[PDB]
Amino acid sequence: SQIRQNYSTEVEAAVNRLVNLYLRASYTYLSLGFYFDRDDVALEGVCHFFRELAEEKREGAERLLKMQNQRGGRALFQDLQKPSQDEWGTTPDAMKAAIVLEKSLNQALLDLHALGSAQADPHLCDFLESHFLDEEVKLIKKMGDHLTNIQRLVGSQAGLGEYLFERLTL
Amino acid sequence: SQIRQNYSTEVEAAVNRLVNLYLRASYTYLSLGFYFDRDDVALEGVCHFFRELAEEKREGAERLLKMQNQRGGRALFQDLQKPSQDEWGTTPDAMKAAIVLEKSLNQALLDLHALGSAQADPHLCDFLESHFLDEEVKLIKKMGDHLTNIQRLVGSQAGLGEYLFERLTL
Amino acid sequence: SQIRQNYSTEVEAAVNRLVNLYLRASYTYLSLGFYFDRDDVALEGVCHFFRELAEEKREGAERLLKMQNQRGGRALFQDLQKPSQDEWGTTPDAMKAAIVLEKSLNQALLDLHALGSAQADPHLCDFLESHFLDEEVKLIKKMGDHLTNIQRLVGSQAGLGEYLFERLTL
Amino acid sequence: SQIRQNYSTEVEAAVNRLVNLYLRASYTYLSLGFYFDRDDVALEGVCHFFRELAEEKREGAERLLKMQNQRGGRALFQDLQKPSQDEWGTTPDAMKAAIVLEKSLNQALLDLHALGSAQADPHLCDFLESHFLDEEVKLIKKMGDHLTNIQRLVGSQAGLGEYLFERLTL
Amino acid sequence: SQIRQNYSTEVEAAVNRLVNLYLRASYTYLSLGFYFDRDDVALEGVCHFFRELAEEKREGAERLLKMQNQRGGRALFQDLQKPSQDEWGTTPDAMKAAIVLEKSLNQALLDLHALGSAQADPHLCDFLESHFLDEEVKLIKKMGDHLTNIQRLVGSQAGLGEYLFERLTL
Ligand SMILES: [Cl-]
Ligand SMILES: [Cl-]
Ligand SMILES: [Cl-]
Ligand SMILES: [Cl-]
Ligand SMILES: [Cl-]
Ligand SMILES: [Cl-]
Ligand SMILES: [Cl-]
Ligand SMILES: [Cl-]
Ligand SMILES: [Cl-]
Ligand SMILES: [Cl-]
C-alpha cells in the first residue's frame, strides 16, 4: 500500500483464489501419491509421480503468495477442500483425473491473465507467462503422453500393462 | 547373575524361544533361496531375496543372544525344526509363505513385548522396539507390496508374469 | 511453566534426585581414579577406567539437567555426599564397589521409569530408554566381565594377577 | 535333471547329509561362542574364535548346497539337532570338543570322497579337494596347536593360564 | 619324448580327439552366433551368447594342445566337420542343441578322466579337474537355467517371450 501501484482489487482477489486452487491441487496429489503407496496398490513409480506433483503445486502457491506481497496485495486464505476421491482406482483413472485437474488450473491461469490484460497489469501478465503458463503446457503434454502409453498397454492384460508402465516409464 | 537385575525367568525363557523361532525362520529362507536356484526353477532375483532374508533372521537371533548375555540370562538352544516344505511352488506361493512366517515372528515379538510390559522390564521393551518391531513392520509392508505386484502379473500369462517380476522388481 | 505439559511434580523431584545420584557416582569414580594413581598403588589402567566413568556419570547428570529444563522443571541441587571410602583396596574390591554403585543407579532409573509409566509421561520413558537404560546394562555387563577375569587371575599369585589384568585388559 | 550327468543318487543323498552335518557344526559353534560371552565366563578371544568358526561352517554348507544345484541334485533339509552341551566348561574342554567335531566332519568328507571315487564322479572329488579337504586339515592343525598351548599353560595356575592364552594367542 | 614320462599312447590319442571335439564345438557356436545375427532373426543377445561360447571352446582346444606338447605328446589334427544344422530355429531350439553339445563334451572329458585314472596319469586327471570339469558343470547349469526361463516365457505369446528373454536376460 505504500508500495502498491497498478494492482487492482480484482487481480488481488483472483490471486488469492488461485493460491487456494494450487494448494488444493497439492492436497489432491498428496492423496493420489499415498493411495499408490498402499500395500494393496503398490505402484511406487506412480506414487513418486504424484508426490512430486504435490510439491510442485505447493511451490506454485508459494510463488503466488510471494508475488501478492511484492505487489502490496494481502494474502487471504480459505479452507482447503478435501480431494474429490478417497480411492483413485487404476493408474489410468488417476492420470485422467490428474489431466482434468491440470486443465482446470490452466484455465484459471488463462482467466487471470485475461483479467490482467483487461486491467492493463503487465507485471502480472509477465509473472504468469514466465512461471506458470509454459510449465502447465509442458505438464499437460507429459500427462497426455502418459495417458496414451497407459491406454496402449491396458488392452491385453491390464495388470501386466499397469506393472510395465510403472516399471519402464515411471 | 552377578549382573542380573530386573530380568524375569519368564522373559529369559521367552527370549530363548524367540531365538529358536528366528533361527528356524533363517533355515526356512535358506531352503526357499536354494529352491529358486534349482535349474528347473531358475529365478535368481527370488533366490537372492530369500537368501538375504536368511541372513537377516540369523542376525536377529544373534542380537537376541547378545542381549540375553547382557542381561545375565542363559542361552538355551533347541533343535531347529526343518522347514515345512521341500519344494516351494511359484514365486507367489513362496511370498505367501514368507508373509505367514513373518506375521508369526511379529506376533512372537508382540507377545514378548507384552510380557516385558507386564514384568515392568523397560530395557526389554526398548530393545524390541529399537531393533525388531519397526524392521518387521517394514518387511511385512514390502512383502505385501510384492504380493500385490505378483498377483497383478499372474493373471495373463503366469510364466511371463513370474519372469517379469523377477527381472524388473527383484 | 509456559512450556510445562504432562510433567508431574513427582517426576520433576525424582529427576532432581537422580541428578544428585549421578553426580555422587561421578565423585565416587573421581576418588577411585585418584586412588589407583597413588605411587603405592600405581595401576594406570585402573585409574583411567574410573576416571572415564567419572566423566560419563557427570555427562549423565548434565543430560538429566538439560531434560529437566526442556520439560519446564526446575533444577534443585543438594549436597554431594563424599564417597563411602577414602581407600579402595584391590582392583577387585574397587570393581565390586563399582558394580554395587551401578546397580543402585540402574534401580533408580528403573524406579523413575515406573513412575513415568504410572504418570503416563511417555517422553520421560523414551528419554530414559534412549540415553540411560541400555548404557547401564552395557556398563554392568562389562564390569561383570572384568570381575570374572580379575577373579580368575587372583587365585595364584594375586599381585601378578592384578598387574596382568591392568596391563592386558585395561 | 535336464542338466544331471554322472551324479549318483548315493552322492546326492550323502551331500544332503553333509549339509546337515555342517549346519549342525555351525550351530554348535554358535553355542560355544555365546557361552564364552557369558558374564561369568568372559573370554572374548574364545568367543570370537568360535563365532568365526560358526560362520565358516555355515559357508561350507552353502557351498555344498550350491554344488548340489549345479549338478542337478535336490537339496533336502532335516532337523538340526541341538548341540550336545548347554555349557562348555573350560577353554580346553571347548577346544577338545571342537577337535572332536572337526575330526567327524573330516571323516564325513573323506567318506564322501571315497563314495565319489567309487561312483567315478571326478567333479565331486575335485570339489571336495579344492574347498574342503585342505581347509579341514589346516583347521585341525591350528586346533591341535591351540590345544598344546592351552595344556602347557594349565598346569600352574589354571585361571592365569586361561587368561593368558585368551589375551596373547586368541 | 626326451620329456615324455607316464604319458600313454591311449591318452595322447584321446587328447587329440578331444581337441577335435572342442574345435568342432567352437565351429558350431560360430554358426549359431551368425544365425542369430541374420536380419530375419535379429536377436543380438543370443548372437553374443554363442559367439562368446565359440571363443571359450577354441580356448579349451588350445589349452589341450599346450598340454599335449608339455607332456611330449604329438598334436594330430583332423577335419572339422561342419555343424549339424544350417539354420537353428528358435532361441529354445538353439539352447536345447547347445545343452546337447555340452553334455557330449562333458561325457568326453569324463571318459578321458576315467582313461587317465586307469593309466595312473594323475597330471592328466588334475589338468582336467582344474580347467575343464567345473567349467563344464557351471556352463551346463547356466544353460539349464536359460532353458527354464525360455520355456516359461514361450507359452503366451512366443514372439514376445523370445524378445523379452533376449532383452532382459542375455
Ligand atoms: Cl518420492
Ligand atoms: Cl521471476
Ligand atoms: Cl545372493
Ligand atoms: Cl541397541
Ligand atoms: Cl585418563
Ligand atoms: Cl535425545
Ligand atoms: Cl566376533
Ligand atoms: Cl570352485
Ligand atoms: Cl559379441
Ligand atoms: Cl594350469
PDB file of C-alpha atoms in Angstrom, chain C residues 34-148:
ATOM      1  CA  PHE C  34      42.979 -40.924  42.006  1.00  0.00           C
ATOM      2  CA  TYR C  35      43.436 -43.781  44.499  1.00  0.00           C
ATOM      3  CA  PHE C  36      44.789 -46.008  41.679  1.00  0.00           C
ATOM      4  CA  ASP C  37      47.144 -43.078  40.676  1.00  0.00           C
ATOM      5  CA  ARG C  38      48.803 -43.200  44.145  1.00  0.00           C
ATOM      6  CA  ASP C  39      52.504 -44.091  43.972  1.00  0.00           C
ATOM      7  CA  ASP C  40      51.862 -47.018  46.392  1.00  0.00           C
ATOM      8  CA  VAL C  41      49.026 -48.420  44.204  1.00  0.00           C
ATOM      9  CA  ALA C  42      50.143 -47.410  40.690  1.00  0.00           C
ATOM     10  CA  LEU C  43      47.710 -49.164  38.354  1.00  0.00           C
ATOM     11  CA  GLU C  44      47.319 -46.715  35.461  1.00  0.00           C
ATOM     12  CA  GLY C  45      44.770 -48.753  33.515  1.00  0.00           C
ATOM     13  CA  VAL C  46      42.564 -48.924  36.602  1.00  0.00           C
ATOM     14  CA  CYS C  47      42.901 -45.184  37.214  1.00  0.00           C
ATOM     15  CA  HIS C  48      41.932 -44.450  33.576  1.00  0.00           C
ATOM     16  CA  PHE C  49      38.947 -46.807  33.755  1.00  0.00           C
ATOM     17  CA  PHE C  50      37.446 -44.983  36.733  1.00  0.00           C
ATOM     18  CA  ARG C  51      38.364 -41.512  35.555  1.00  0.00           C
ATOM     19  CA  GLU C  52      36.469 -42.219  32.287  1.00  0.00           C
ATOM     20  CA  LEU C  53      33.470 -43.394  34.367  1.00  0.00           C
ATOM     21  CA  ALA C  54      33.614 -40.148  36.392  1.00  0.00           C
ATOM     22  CA  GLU C  55      33.202 -38.226  33.160  1.00  0.00           C
ATOM     23  CA  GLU C  56      30.386 -40.460  31.891  1.00  0.00           C
ATOM     24  CA  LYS C  57      28.337 -40.033  35.116  1.00  0.00           C
ATOM     25  CA  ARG C  58      28.838 -36.264  35.063  1.00  0.00           C
ATOM     26  CA  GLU C  59      27.599 -36.240  31.457  1.00  0.00           C
ATOM     27  CA  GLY C  60      24.556 -38.303  32.523  1.00  0.00           C
ATOM     28  CA  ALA C  61      23.748 -35.694  35.165  1.00  0.00           C
ATOM     29  CA  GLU C  62      24.051 -32.838  32.644  1.00  0.00           C
ATOM     30  CA  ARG C  63      21.714 -34.599  30.195  1.00  0.00           C
ATOM     31  CA  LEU C  64      19.123 -35.004  33.011  1.00  0.00           C
ATOM     32  CA  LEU C  65      19.512 -31.316  33.863  1.00  0.00           C
ATOM     33  CA  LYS C  66      19.015 -30.340  30.199  1.00  0.00           C
ATOM     34  CA  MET C  67      15.870 -32.510  30.069  1.00  0.00           C
ATOM     35  CA  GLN C  68      14.518 -31.019  33.315  1.00  0.00           C
ATOM     36  CA  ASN C  69      14.746 -27.540  31.655  1.00  0.00           C
ATOM     37  CA  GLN C  70      13.310 -28.804  28.325  1.00  0.00           C
ATOM     38  CA  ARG C  71      10.206 -30.015  30.227  1.00  0.00           C
ATOM     39  CA  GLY C  72       9.875 -26.837  32.298  1.00  0.00           C
ATOM     40  CA  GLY C  73      11.020 -28.471  35.525  1.00  0.00           C
ATOM     41  CA  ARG C  74      13.272 -26.633  37.977  1.00  0.00           C
ATOM     42  CA  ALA C  75      16.724 -27.984  38.841  1.00  0.00           C
ATOM     43  CA  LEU C  76      17.375 -28.162  42.560  1.00  0.00           C
ATOM     44  CA  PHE C  77      20.753 -29.172  43.794  1.00  0.00           C
ATOM     45  CA  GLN C  78      21.679 -30.834  47.063  1.00  0.00           C
ATOM     46  CA  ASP C  79      24.965 -31.543  48.843  1.00  0.00           C
ATOM     47  CA  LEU C  80      27.064 -34.212  47.214  1.00  0.00           C
ATOM     48  CA  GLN C  81      27.949 -36.682  49.823  1.00  0.00           C
ATOM     49  CA  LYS C  82      31.528 -37.733  49.923  1.00  0.00           C
ATOM     50  CA  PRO C  83      32.345 -41.197  48.616  1.00  0.00           C
ATOM     51  CA  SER C  84      31.918 -44.077  51.044  1.00  0.00           C
ATOM     52  CA  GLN C  85      35.654 -44.987  51.250  1.00  0.00           C
ATOM     53  CA  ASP C  86      38.921 -42.985  51.373  1.00  0.00           C
ATOM     54  CA  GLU C  87      40.936 -46.044  50.203  1.00  0.00           C
ATOM     55  CA  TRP C  88      39.520 -48.613  47.793  1.00  0.00           C
ATOM     56  CA  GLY C  89      41.670 -51.707  48.344  1.00  0.00           C
ATOM     57  CA  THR C  90      42.455 -54.016  45.460  1.00  0.00           C
ATOM     58  CA  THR C  91      41.294 -53.775  41.851  1.00  0.00           C
ATOM     59  CA  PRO C  92      38.697 -56.461  42.717  1.00  0.00           C
ATOM     60  CA  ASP C  93      37.456 -54.521  45.764  1.00  0.00           C
ATOM     61  CA  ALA C  94      37.111 -51.461  43.541  1.00  0.00           C
ATOM     62  CA  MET C  95      35.325 -53.288  40.730  1.00  0.00           C
ATOM     63  CA  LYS C  96      32.916 -54.914  43.243  1.00  0.00           C
ATOM     64  CA  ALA C  97      32.156 -51.474  44.689  1.00  0.00           C
ATOM     65  CA  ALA C  98      31.670 -50.106  41.153  1.00  0.00           C
ATOM     66  CA  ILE C  99      29.093 -52.818  40.255  1.00  0.00           C
ATOM     67  CA  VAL C 100      27.213 -52.064  43.510  1.00  0.00           C
ATOM     68  CA  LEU C 101      27.153 -48.392  42.575  1.00  0.00           C
ATOM     69  CA  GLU C 102      25.964 -49.102  39.047  1.00  0.00           C
ATOM     70  CA  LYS C 103      23.208 -51.472  40.186  1.00  0.00           C
ATOM     71  CA  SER C 104      21.907 -48.722  42.506  1.00  0.00           C
ATOM     72  CA  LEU C 105      21.927 -46.198  39.607  1.00  0.00           C
ATOM     73  CA  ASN C 106      20.148 -48.740  37.406  1.00  0.00           C
ATOM     74  CA  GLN C 107      17.499 -49.378  40.043  1.00  0.00           C
ATOM     75  CA  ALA C 108      16.961 -45.600  40.366  1.00  0.00           C
ATOM     76  CA  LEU C 109      16.490 -45.391  36.543  1.00  0.00           C
ATOM     77  CA  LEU C 110      14.065 -48.325  36.673  1.00  0.00           C
ATOM     78  CA  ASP C 111      12.165 -46.689  39.519  1.00  0.00           C
ATOM     79  CA  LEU C 112      11.960 -43.383  37.595  1.00  0.00           C
ATOM     80  CA  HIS C 113      10.742 -45.217  34.512  1.00  0.00           C
ATOM     81  CA  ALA C 114       7.998 -46.920  36.573  1.00  0.00           C
ATOM     82  CA  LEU C 115       6.958 -43.507  37.948  1.00  0.00           C
ATOM     83  CA  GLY C 116       6.869 -42.116  34.397  1.00  0.00           C
ATOM     84  CA  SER C 117       4.724 -45.056  33.209  1.00  0.00           C
ATOM     85  CA  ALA C 118       2.320 -44.503  36.161  1.00  0.00           C
ATOM     86  CA  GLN C 119       2.150 -40.746  35.443  1.00  0.00           C
ATOM     87  CA  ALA C 120       1.625 -41.542  31.692  1.00  0.00           C
ATOM     88  CA  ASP C 121       4.731 -39.489  30.763  1.00  0.00           C
ATOM     89  CA  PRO C 122       5.979 -41.211  27.581  1.00  0.00           C
ATOM     90  CA  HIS C 123       8.578 -38.525  26.822  1.00  0.00           C
ATOM     91  CA  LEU C 124      10.298 -39.336  30.136  1.00  0.00           C
ATOM     92  CA  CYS C 125      10.037 -43.046  29.447  1.00  0.00           C
ATOM     93  CA  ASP C 126      11.600 -42.595  25.967  1.00  0.00           C
ATOM     94  CA  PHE C 127      14.293 -40.283  27.308  1.00  0.00           C
ATOM     95  CA  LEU C 128      15.428 -42.890  29.831  1.00  0.00           C
ATOM     96  CA  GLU C 129      15.283 -45.722  27.325  1.00  0.00           C
ATOM     97  CA  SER C 130      17.276 -43.879  24.715  1.00  0.00           C
ATOM     98  CA  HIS C 131      20.123 -42.435  26.869  1.00  0.00           C
ATOM     99  CA  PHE C 132      20.329 -44.389  30.136  1.00  0.00           C
ATOM    100  CA  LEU C 133      18.807 -47.912  30.326  1.00  0.00           C
ATOM    101  CA  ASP C 134      20.897 -49.616  27.613  1.00  0.00           C
ATOM    102  CA  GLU C 135      24.092 -47.705  28.604  1.00  0.00           C
ATOM    103  CA  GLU C 136      23.680 -49.009  32.175  1.00  0.00           C
ATOM    104  CA  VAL C 137      23.021 -52.567  31.018  1.00  0.00           C
ATOM    105  CA  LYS C 138      26.127 -52.452  28.763  1.00  0.00           C
ATOM    106  CA  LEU C 139      28.305 -50.997  31.561  1.00  0.00           C
ATOM    107  CA  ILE C 140      27.161 -53.571  34.126  1.00  0.00           C
ATOM    108  CA  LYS C 141      27.895 -56.437  31.656  1.00  0.00           C
ATOM    109  CA  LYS C 142      31.418 -55.005  31.107  1.00  0.00           C
ATOM    110  CA  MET C 143      32.013 -54.768  34.848  1.00  0.00           C
ATOM    111  CA  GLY C 144      30.777 -58.279  35.344  1.00  0.00           C
ATOM    112  CA  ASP C 145      33.175 -59.476  32.576  1.00  0.00           C
ATOM    113  CA  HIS C 146      36.033 -57.623  34.322  1.00  0.00           C
ATOM    114  CA  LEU C 147      35.103 -59.068  37.690  1.00  0.00           C
ATOM    115  CA  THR C 148      35.222 -62.615  36.298  1.00  0.00           C
TER     116      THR C 148
END
